[PDB]
Design a protein around this ligand. Structure first.
Ligand SMILES: C[C@H](NC(=O)n1nc(N)nc1Nc1ccc(Cl)cc1)c1ccccc1
Length: 341
């Protein structure tokens, strides 16, 4: 055979995977099994989206497909997909919430890598929409790689999907941007920068910034630090009940970040304040955040590429049956092997 299994291991971005090694080279890899991959439309579409996205990117701070196993059995019998990935022993969740060191320099280095990968991803017109410490994989050499692209979308989405109307269900509550919570009809790469700010804050205090218990409590926590949202953002709130709830509340001023995180690094808090804004268009971009004095130690524009050409989500807006999706996944596996040799 081509690979030798070592052990079943946990993974922040993809759950249960197998640590393995290539028999000829001894190279360590992670092997992810997607069992019964073609049984449910929503799961099958997600597998296709993830394969396409990961094949499009070629960046050290984004998880790479190292190999995809070809069907060894008849087409009709091909039911499970095996993807060979970079082996990542940990993730930012496990590091932050452990007894491991996490100095300002760890924060600065992890933030840098995350923003480096985002700058490249964002130039490809891809919004991750689910950034959280658990899907930011970290290996033994301290390399951070963004994983778990199931929630990723472009600047344009199909009305046929439920999330197009129900934005407050997009991704993880604790990292979910105000435009998603409130349906502000402005959904860009700025969604990711709110999540980055939440992650940045979490590394600084080694605790979640807005750990909301439910929908309303999540907004309350955000408002406790950011203050009452402006009249223009309140008018942009889609739902009348939420809009009335926000308007019913007494006015509140923003709490300076120097009060949220007492004695924290000045340049860190400066960049943090540029990320955590109610208004999507007021947030700093990944590219400009890389130009902030806080990351100057690592910042090198010649070593921080963009992704050309942009990624197209058109294949995902198509209404395809489970069989047609299986056909497209099988074509992706073939294309992967054809492009190598
Ligand atoms: C969160 C995880 N799901 C998961 O990894 N999925 N699910 C689908 N449809 N596709 C993938 N992963 C995937 C697809 C392509 C590539 Cl290149 C890499 C990974 C899960 C783990 C255990 C139990 C339930 C869910």
């Amino acid at each position: 055979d081509e690979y030798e299994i070592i052990e079943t291991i946990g993974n922040g971005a993809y759950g249960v995977v197998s640590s393995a090694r290539r028999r000829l080279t001894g190279q360590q890899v992670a092997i992810k099994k997607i069992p019964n991959a073609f049984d449910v439309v929503t799961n099958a579409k997600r597998t296709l989206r993830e394969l396409k996205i990961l094949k499009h990117f070629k960046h050290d701070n984004i998880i790479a497909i190292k190999d995809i196993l070809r069907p060894t059995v008849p087409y009709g019998e091909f039911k499970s997909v095996y993807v060979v990935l970079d082996l990542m022993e940990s993730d930012l969740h496990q590091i932050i919430h452990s007894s491991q060191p996490l100095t300002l320099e760890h924060v600065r280095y992890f933030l840098y890598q995350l923003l480096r990968g985002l700058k490249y991803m964002h130039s490809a017109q891809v919004i991750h929409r689910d950034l959280k410490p658990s899907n930011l994989l970290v290996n033994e050499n301290c390399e951070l790689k963004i994983g778990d692209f199931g929630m990723a979308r472009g600047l344009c989405t199909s009305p046929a999907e439920h999330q197009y109307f129900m934005t407050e269900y997009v991704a993880t509550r604790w990292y979910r941007a105000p435009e998603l919570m409130l349906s502000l009809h402005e959904y860009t790469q700025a969604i990711d920068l709110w999540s980055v700010g939440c992650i940045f804050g979490e590394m600084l205090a080694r605790r979640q910034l807005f750990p909301g218990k439910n929908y309303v409590h999540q907004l309350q926590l955000i408002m406790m630090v950011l203050g009452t949202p402006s009249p223009a953002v309140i008018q942009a709130v889609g739902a009348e009940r939420v809009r009335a709830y926000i308007q019913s509340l007494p006015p509140r001023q923003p709490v300076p970040w120097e009060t949220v995180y007492p004695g924290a690094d000045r340049q860190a808090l400066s960049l943090l304040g540029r990320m955590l804004r109610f208004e999507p268009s007021a947030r700093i971009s990944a590219a400009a955040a890389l130009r902030h004095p806080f990351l100057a130690k690592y910042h090198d524009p010649d070593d921080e590429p963009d992704c050309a050409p942009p990624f197209d989500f058109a294949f995902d807006r198509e209404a395809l049956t489970r069989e047609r999706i299986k056909e497209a996944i099988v074509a992706e596996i073939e294309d992967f092997h054809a492009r190598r040799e």
